[PDB]
Every structure is written in C-alpha cells, then in structure tokens.
C-alpha cells in the first residue's frame with residue numbers, strides 16, 4: 001500500500017474551495033479559477049487551477065495531515081500547463097512544515113522544499129530544486145531546463161532516505177544524483193529528512209497569466225507516482241495536442 005499524503009485532481013466542481021486557502025498577507029493577490037482552458041484532453045479531467053490575472057502575485061495553499069519523510073521516500077508530483085505562451089511566471093510548489101499560517105502565507109514564509117519550473121524571459125528556463133538546510137534555502141547546483149510550450153507537462157521530484165534524488169519531466173528522468181554532491185550543504189546522512197510536511201503552496205509571480213496546475217500528488221511510493229502520472233498526464237497529452245492542432 002502506497003501512503004497517499006495528498007492528492008488533488010479537482011474532479012468535483014467547486015468543492016476545491018474547501019480544500020484550498022487564499023492568503024490575505026497582501027490585499028491584491030491574483031485569483032485562481034478552476035478551468036480546463038481553451039484546449040484540453042478531456043473537459044472534466046483537465047480542470048485545474050488557472051492563474052486568471054496578469055502581473056500578479058499568487059498565494060494559495062492546501063493542508064494535509066502532517067508527516068515526516070524520515071526513513072522513507074518522498075515524492076512530489078504535479079502537472080503545469082502554460083497555455084498562455086508565458087513570458088515570465090513561476091510554475092513551482094513549496095512544501096511547508098506544520099507551523100505555517102495559511103492565511104498569512106507569502107514568498108518569504110519558511111518552507112522545507114521548493115520544486116518546479118520557473119520561467120522569466122529566455123535567460124531563466126529552470127527547474128528549481130531547493131532544500132532548506134541550516135537556516136538557508138539551498139538551490140541545486142545543476143541546470144535542469146524547464147518546458148516552455150503551451151502543453152501539459154508532468155513534474156516529479158523523488159527524495160530517498162539514502163540522500164539520493166531524482167527529477168522527472170513527463171515521467172522520464174532528466175536529473176539524478178546525491179544531495180551531498182549537487183547542493184552545497186557541505187557526512188550528514190539526515191539532509192533529506194524533515195520533521196514535518198503539512199501544507200503544499202502555490203507562491204508565484206506571473207506577467208502573462210493563464211497557467212493551469214493539476215494532478216497534485218505527495219506520496220512515499222515512486223512506482224505509484226509513476227503509475228498515477230501515466231493515468232493522469234499520460235492520458236491528457238495526446239488528446240490535448242489533437243484539440244490544439246484542430247484549432248488551426
């Protein structure tokens with residue numbers, strides 16, 4: 001049995017609003033809307049959270065029953081679709097410990113892990129993998145290129161209790177190594193371990209909005225995340241491109 005710490009597919013209309021909390025740290029955060037977009041694999045399945053306002057900060061998050069990854073594997077997975085042809089805007093998630101106030105979450109709130117694609121002009125086309133360690137948020141020393149097209153892509157981070165990690169895009173490995181080698185933490189066997197995870201958050205800036213996020217999964221099972229990804233992103237992809245191609 002895989003431990004399913006968090007799953008979000010937005011399959012039940014407006015009920016997501018009971019699961020996700022808007023921060024009030026700023027009064028002028030942009031709004032997320034539930035949408036499948038202009039083109040999609042399936043109208044119902046491909047509903048997800050869409051940024052709806054240009055040049056805005058975004059702060060929305062969802063709690064789950066707290067857990068620690070000590071002694072086990074951690075997998076964070078979601079899909080990102082920059083349907084708008086983005087110029088500049090984030091597409092990454094943050095995982096927060098139990099202490100976070102969801103009503104006051106912002107860019108500088110303390111987080112454990114930040115993972116996902118970031119785009120800001122041609123210079124920044126990066127997959128972030130950031131670990132909080134000894135009071136610092138440490139960025140991976142490797143260049144992982146993010147996808148920049150209009151289509152749905154799957155992002156997966158795997159963190160294992162032997163201090164190894166793996167990044168997959170579209171369910172295929174793009175980067176791999178050990179935590180000791182690929183970040184400047186600098187023989188600590190417990191770097192990977194955090195005492196709690198309790199909230200997943202979207203803390204973004206976007207110029208051109210319209211990004212859609214879907215199919216969030218936090219789990220301890222690599223094989224399951226891979227299956228879920230094929231059942232999810234893997235079914236979206238071909239039908240989505242078909243519909244877009246139809247659209248001259």
Ligand SMILES: OC[C@H]1O[C@H](O[C@@H]2[C@H](O)[C@@H](O[C@@H]3[C@@H](O[C@H]4[C@@H](O)[C@H](O)[C@@H](CO)O[C@@H]4O)O[C@H](CO)[C@@H](O)[C@@H]3O)O[C@H](CO)[C@H]2O)[C@H](O)[C@@H](O)[C@@H]1O
Pocket residue numbers: 057088089090091106107108114118119120124137203204205206
């Ligand atoms: O990038 C590592 C960093 O990420 C997290 O913090 C994010 C930043 O605080 C910021 O993201 C940047 C923002 O940049 C632009 C705009 O706001 C600036 O004023 C402008 C001036 O140079 O440049 C950009 O236009 O957005 C872009 C697009 O996503 C990012 O690439 C920039 O990094 O704001 C976001 C949203 O609040 C933060 O998530 C982590 O919190 C931090 O620890 C980490 O080091």
Ligand SMILES: [Ca+2]
Pocket residue numbers: 009010011044045046047048214215
């Ligand atoms: Ca969905």
